[PDB]
Each structure stands twice: as C-alpha cells, then as structure tokens.
Amino acid sequence: SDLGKKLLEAARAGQDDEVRILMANGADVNAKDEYGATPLHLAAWTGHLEIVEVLLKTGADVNAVDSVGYTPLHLAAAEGHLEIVEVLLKTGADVNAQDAQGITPLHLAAWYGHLEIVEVLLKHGADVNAQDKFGKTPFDLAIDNGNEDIAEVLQKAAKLN
C-alpha cells in the first residue's frame, strides 16, 4: 500500500532497520515500482546484503521478474555482488532465468567482467552455453567485451559438461 512505496525506497537506500520496521508493520514484500522491481530486486541491484537476507526471510519471491524479465539474480550478477549472488542461489534463485531478450545471469556476469560470479553460477548449474535472442553465449559476450579470462573459464566448463 502506502507502505510498499516506503519499503521500495528503504530497500533501494539500504535502510536495513527501516525495512525490518515496515515488514513488521505489514508492508507488501512483493510491492513493485513503476518498472516492476520488488524491494528484493532493488536491494540485490544496490548490494544491500543484509536487506536481501531480511527480505528472503520475510517471504520475498526470489524469482520475481521486472518489466523486462530481470530477476534479482540478474541484477546482482551484473553489478558483481558476490555474497548476494550466493545467498540468492542458496534460497532458490533460478540460476538459468532468461529475461525478455534471452539474457541469463551468466551472460551478464561474463559481459560485465565478474569472474568470481561466473564461477559461482557454473557451480550452481548455470547453462554454460545459454543463447540470447542474438544466438550469443556467455563466452561470445566475454570475448566481445575483452574478458578473455572469463572466456577460458567458460570453454573449460563446456568441454567437461
């Protein structure tokens, strides 16, 4: 309600105890902003690990999708937020979630150069050669954006499935 807006702002701004106060006061954990983001997307995006943990404990849908099909795991993988990617995967995140352009968390971590994140996604069963709407794999995105070290990690996981 009124509380949904306040919850989105607190999640986004990293006010962890204000998040705890609004949740106990009945705020909708799955409130969505104008672009479809829940408080869990905004906390994951902005690297607020404590708030991620609080929202997951208070019932947040770990696989909520925004207006272009991003999950919280997409945004944490793109921003390189390792501990958030781990907690999301331990609490039921879909490691292979594709947005509306067929982009996965592995595609985003490969492009934006997050090698530790790429390894953690593979560990948790990321499809190493997921193709987007342009036929591109995470390997092609790592090559295209000059992250050859991530390309090597991905070509070794593909040879050994």
């Binding site: 983001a37 905004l42 925004d66 272009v68 945004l75 595609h107 492009w111 987007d132």
Partner: peptide, 15 residues
C-alpha cells in the same frame, strides 16, 4: 552497451 543496467533497462539497447 550501458556501463550499468538496472530494473526495466534491457541489456541490448543500442550502445
């Protein structure tokens, strides 16, 4: 390409 993405901001959007 964008240096960052975010909610509502698709990965493939021109530059």
């Amino acid at each position: 390409k964008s240096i960052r993405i975010g909610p509502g901001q698709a990965f493939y959007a021109x530059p």
